[PDB]
């Protein structure tokens, strides 16, 4: 109940929201149907429009007008944004040449530059170039401030997940807004864009910027605007708040625009009708900047222009229907569209089985336009599994497509020409970032980055301590003139052992064999030196990874590779090796095909054994350092050590062997040498974080050998490819992957063909940031380079996307 009989007199767009049943005058009161009776009259004035004209200049104040052109308007803070231009001979902000803002130039009583976030729904990254002729204010922000060619949204590339990620620095799985529609089985409640459930606080996890600010004594403008409040009024309200006395004035503000998304759905991302919404958004930016200029704040405020996601061409005719695949379509609930999420229609139906649904959805049609996944098998880069609101079955839909349950859903709910929600690496889903103001750099282009990074920077801009989040704080220091955050590298928690030769061959009873019984003082000292680390400079190029948790492990040196061998997991945590452009690929010789050799540096008790693999009919093994890339016939024996062996399903061995035999040498040829670090990952509870021992769900049959859920590789070379990877003077270049360790290749519909037709496609889908691997392994890479630590943090958040 609302007692809408109070009044909004002197309360229009009040900051503190009052409690029911007292009526509200805040910018969201319309959304709650709780505004006081006179809210429209007093707070939503429209009379005479939004612009001064010549005849209005110096007018007598009429309180009824939307904005003012009287002499008193400046001290009242409520002039039309073009007042000084029309009436005082001033220029529009956009017509002024840009001049570097070297220091904040702020009016007295301003304690810090205010931050204004100007957020635009559905603003596709390529609109910055393609619409630049019709967006002169935005183009000035872009060219004069700091910009990225695009900013990567989070998956799913929907509005609510991305807006809340922007505000929190969190992945959707952590902040809890995992879709625009959700069902939470614990609450037994549904979240929808329409309706009241979405205002319940229990949906919204983490800590958004406006709460971080308030908790630390920084006043925030309300970030949200009821849809019926026109943009011009949103701007005037922000400019009015900026005129408040110092003790009442917010330091952070947000504007939100439902455009160009609204029109993009109707017309497609580049429909001819899209020009007008882009002009309109530019005009709104113009009003803000002219308004700031009138307040003498245009060289004081940091302005962020940022989108939530892009927009793709999608029409009704490009819809896959689950009724064309499933016998039992009425026994499931689908959350449809540009991603699919499936669960049981009834929790009472015990005939429901996700395995038979996945199978019925797998490679059934030649050009099938979605792919089914159990959520834990989705590419780890999406970070889209660790939440009870994310259904176990997920459909990754091809760009330009929809999935629906039955045809009647699509013509009983063609209209639209645009949509979004797809995989966040899809080019059409990329969005925009521009920062302009004293704290941002001048005329600086920065590489693309992920929106999860911005919360930290917005906290930096406001002098706030960020709540714990998924950004990597310092990775965006290159955007900033000042307020940089200078982190220290984490401290190593476990130091390695460096074992020498401690065991005789006969102490091992591993059931392994190797034909290595075939035989020099020149060359004997040489191989001893290799075991002591004499080639380590070649193969460990950026220092050894640091282990950031408590464990027992050994550094093992070899001619061709170095490893950190875990006594607890019976395998390396990491294996590091460098392959020059000149390296040659060889085969596994016949007499060594089934060779596994005891490692006399590591006890039988801390070793794998071959008998376990013999007995486990499902499980085979592979090697982390590939025997194919041995530097010599004699060094090749090192590659068959039991301490280089890892458990691998035969289906996975197809992928791995092609990566090792063919792809590594290809990358070395193309990149002028590569350094490779490979290893296992164990993430049985799909939380994106390293499992402890007691979380491991699967072992090689009969043994204590844990089975990895994933295998990673980090592939580093010189950004200047005229220099070899191992003699690089400047910035690095990296690509990485986290490949799912699966007992079939059902994910790859073409896997019956030669690995040259499907393996690299699989690896591209599972591309990763070094930072993703760090979370999953508890390791910290690149500890010893010549490079600045912030530069290294940027490198660690890099994602190689393979979008051309
Ligand atoms: C991305 O960044 C984020 C933020 O840094 C990372 O997430 C953090 O990860 C931590 C480890 O997983 C986690 O720490 C845990 O905190 C538990 C208490 O958490 C509550 O309080 C905090 C602080 O206010 C709050 O943020 C939490 O909010 C979550 O839950 C609410 C309500 O459910 C949601 O609204 C909200 O969205 C959020 O949900 C997300 O996180 C939870 C996990 O907390 C998930 O389950 C959800 O799916 C969702 O993703 C909470 O309100 C605390 O209980 C934990 O302690 C256990 O483990 C420790 C290890 O130190 C152990 O010593 C303890 O004994 C304890 O175990 C006991 O409980 C077990 C489980 O019930 C039980 O089995 C045992 O027997 C024990 O009794 C733990 O310390 C932190 O909460 C989250 N934070 C957030 C915001 O998500 C994330 O990891 C990053 N991602 C990547 C890939 O790097
Ligand atoms: N109609 C609206 O006004 C409306 C409605 C729903 C909104 N969200 C949906 C999920 C969370 C809130 C927002 C978003 C506000 C917002 C503005 C700027 C932002 O970028 C940042 F964080 F960088 F500041 C982040 C969030 C605005
Ligand atoms: Ca949106
Ligand atoms: Ca885990
Ligand atoms: Na086997
Ligand atoms: Na297949
Ligand atoms: Zn949309």
Residue 121, marked binder: yes
Catalytic residue among 4, 81, 157, 159: 159
Query: Is 357 touching ligand 2 by the criterion CB < 6 Å?
Result: no
Give CA–CA dist 662/646, Å, rounded: 20
Active site annotation includes 575: no
CATH number of the domain at 615, please. Answer: 3.40.570.10
Beta strands in 455-588 (DSSP E): 546-547, 553-557, 562-566, 571-579
Resolution in A: 1.7
Contact 176, 167 (CB under 8 A): no
SS3 119: strand
Query: Is 113 touching ligand 1 by the criterion CB < 6 Å?
Result: no
Rounded distance from Cα 11 to ligand 4 centre (Å): 50
Is the bond leading into 218 cis (omega within 30 degrees of zero)?
A: no
Give CA–CA dist 120/260, Å, rounded: 7
Give CA–CA dist 518/368, Å, rounded: 55
CA dihedral 366, 367, 373, 377 (to 10 degrees): 100
Contact 586, 636 (CB under 8 A): yes
Experimental method: X-ray
* Residue from 592, 704, 599, 682 nearest 643 by CA: 599
Report in angstroms the alpha-carbon separations of 633 from 592, 595, 601, 733.
Answer: 11, 14, 22, 31
Interacting residues of 658 by C-beta distance below 8 A, sequence separation 6+: 755, 756, 759
Dihedrals phi, psi of 659, to nearest 5 degrees? -55, -50
43's enclosing H/E stretch is helix 39-43
Residue 309, marked binder: yes
Contact 285, 137 (CB under 8 A): yes
Query: Is 205 touching ligand 1 by the criterion CB < 6 Å?
Result: yes
Neighbour tally for 503: CB within 10 Å: 16
Give CA–CA dist 600/637, Å, rounded: 13
Residue nearest to atom 47 of ligand 1 (CA): 387
CA dihedral 457, 458, 460, 465 (to 10 degrees): -110
* Residue from 184, 103, 150, 706 nearest 440 by CA: 103
Tokens of 204: 């919204």
Give CA–CA dist 733/713, Å, rounded: 14
Rounded distance from Cα 406 to ligand 2 centre (Å): 33
Give CA–CA dist 189/167, Å, rounded: 24
Tokens of 503: 């065991």
Output 696-704 pairs: Cβ under 8 A, ≥24 positions apart. 700/608, 700/612, 700/613, 700/616, 700/619, 700/647, 701/612, 701/615, 701/616, 701/617, 701/618, 701/619, 702/612, 702/615, 702/616, 703/608, 703/609, 703/612, 703/616, 704/570
Rounded distance from Cα 655 to ligand 6 centre (Å): 12
Domain that holds residue 606: 505-797
Which residue matches tokens 């929190």?
168
> What does the radius of gyration of the chain's CA atoms come to, in whole angstroms?
30
Give CA–CA dist 115/253, Å, rounded: 6
116's enclosing H/E stretch is strand 115-121
SS3 397: strand
Beta strands 146-147 and 444-445: pairing type? parallel
Outline where 100-171 has alpha helix (H).
127-130, 136-144, 159-168
| H helix count then E strand count, the chain | 22, 29
Interacting residues of 396 by C-beta distance below 8 A, sequence separation 6+: 339, 370, 371, 373, 378, 423
* Residue from 574, 524, 528 nearest 554 by CA: 574
Instruction: Ligand 1, residue 204: give the atom nearest the CA.
Output: 35
């Amino acid at each position: 109940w609302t007692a809408t009989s109070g009044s909004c007199k002197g309360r229009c767009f009040e900051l503190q929201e009052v409690g029911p049943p007292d009526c509200r005058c805040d910018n969201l009161c319309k959304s709650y149907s709780s505004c006081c009776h006179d809210f429209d009259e007093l707070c939503l004035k429209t009379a005479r429009g939004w612009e001064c004209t010549k005849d209005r200049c110096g007018e007598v104040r009429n309180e009824e007008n939307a904005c003012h052109c009287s002499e008193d308007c400046l001290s009242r803070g409520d002039c039309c944004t073009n007042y000084q231009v029309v009436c005082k001979g001033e220029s529009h902000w956009v017509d002024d040449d840009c001049e570097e803002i070297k220091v904040p130039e702020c009016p007295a009583g301003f304690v810090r530059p205010p931050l204004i976030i100007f957020s635009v729904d559905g603003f596709r990254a390529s609109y910055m170039k393609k619409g630049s002729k019709v967006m002169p204010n935005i183009e000035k922000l872009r060219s004069c401030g700091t910009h990225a060619p695009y900013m990567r949204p989070v998956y799913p590339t929907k509005t609510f997940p991305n807006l809340y990620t922007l505000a929190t620095g969190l992945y959707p799985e952590s902040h809890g807004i995992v879709g625009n529609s959700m069902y939470d089985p614990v609450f037994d409640a549904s979240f929808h864009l329409r309706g009241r459930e979405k205002f319940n606080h229990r949906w919204w996890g983490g800590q958004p910027l406006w709460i971080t600010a308030t908790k630390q004594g920084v006043r925030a403008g309300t970030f949200f605007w009821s849809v019926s409040i026109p943009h011009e009024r949103r701007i005037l309200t922000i400019l009015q708040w900026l005129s408040l006395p110092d003790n009442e004035r917010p330091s952070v503000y947000a504007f939100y625009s439902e455009q160009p998304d609204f029109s993009g759905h109707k017309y497609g991302p580049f429909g001819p009708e899209m020009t007008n919404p882009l002009r309109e958004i530019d005009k709104t930016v113009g009003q803000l900047m002219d308004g700031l200029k009138q307040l003498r704040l245009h060289r004081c405020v940091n302005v962020i222009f940022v989108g939530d996601h892009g927009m793709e061409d999608v029409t009704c005719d490009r819809t896959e229907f689950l009724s064309n695949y499933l016998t039992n379509v009425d026994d499931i609930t689908l959350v449809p569209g540009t991603l699919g999420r499936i669960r049981a229609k009834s929790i009472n139906n015990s005939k429901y089985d996700p395995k038979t649904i996945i199978a019925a959805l797998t490679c059934k049609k030649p050009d099938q336009h979605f792919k089914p996944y159990m959520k834990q098998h989705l590419p780890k880069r999406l970070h889209y599994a660790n939440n009870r609101r994310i259904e176990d079955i997920h459909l990754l839909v091809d760009r330009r497509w929809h999935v629906a349950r039955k045809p009647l859903d699509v013509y009983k709910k063609c209209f639209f020409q645009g949509d979004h929600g797809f995989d966040n690496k899809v080019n059409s889903m990329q969005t925009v970032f521009v920062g302009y103001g004293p704290t941002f750099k001048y005329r600086t282009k920065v590489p693309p980055f992920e929106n999860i990074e911005l919360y930290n920077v917005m906290c930096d801009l406001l002098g706030l301590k960020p709540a714990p989040n998924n950004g990597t704080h310092g990775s965006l220091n290159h955007l900033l003139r000042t307020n940089t955050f200078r982190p220290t590298m984490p401290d190593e928690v476990s130091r390695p052992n460096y074992p020498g030769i401690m065991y005789l061959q006969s102490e091992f009873d591993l059931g392994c064999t190797c034909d290595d019984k075939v035989e020099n003082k020149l060359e004997e000292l040489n191989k001893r030196l290799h075991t002591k680390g004499s080639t380590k400079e070649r193969h460990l190029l950026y220092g050894r990874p640091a282990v950031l948790y408590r464990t027992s492990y050994d550094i093992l040196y070899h001619t061709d590779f170095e490893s950190g061998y875990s006594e607890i997991f019976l395998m390396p945590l990491w294996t590091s090796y460098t392959i020059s452009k000149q390296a040659e690929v060889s085969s596994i010789p016949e007499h060594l095909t089934n060779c596994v050799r005891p490692d006399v540096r590591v006890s039988p008790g801390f070793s794998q054994n071959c008998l376990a693999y013999k007995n486990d009919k499902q499980m085979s093994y592979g090697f982390l350092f590939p025997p194919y890339l041995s530097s010599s016939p004699e060094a090749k024996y090192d590659a068959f050590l039991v301490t280089n062996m890892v458990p691998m399903y035969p289906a996975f061995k197809r992928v791995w062997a092609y990566f090792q035999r063919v792809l590594v040498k290809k990358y070395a040829s193309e990149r002028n040498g590569v350094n490779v670090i490979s290893g296992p990952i164990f993430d049985y509870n799909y939380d994106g974080l390293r499992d402890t021992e007691d979380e491991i769900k699967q072992y090689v049959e009969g043994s204590s050998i844990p089975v990895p859920t994933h295998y990673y590789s980090i592939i580093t070379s010189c950004l200047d490819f005229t220099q070899p990877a191992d003699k690089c003077d400047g910035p690095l270049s990296v690509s990485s992957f986290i490949l799912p360790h699966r007992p079939d290749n059902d994910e790859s519909c073409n896997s019956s063909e030669d690995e040259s037709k499907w393996v690299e496609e699989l690896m591209k889908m599972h591309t990763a940031r070094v930072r993703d691997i760090e979370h999953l392994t508890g390791l910290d890479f690149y500890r010893k380079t010549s490079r600045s630590y912030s530069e290294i943090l940027t490198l660690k958040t890099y994602l190689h996307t393979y979008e051309s």
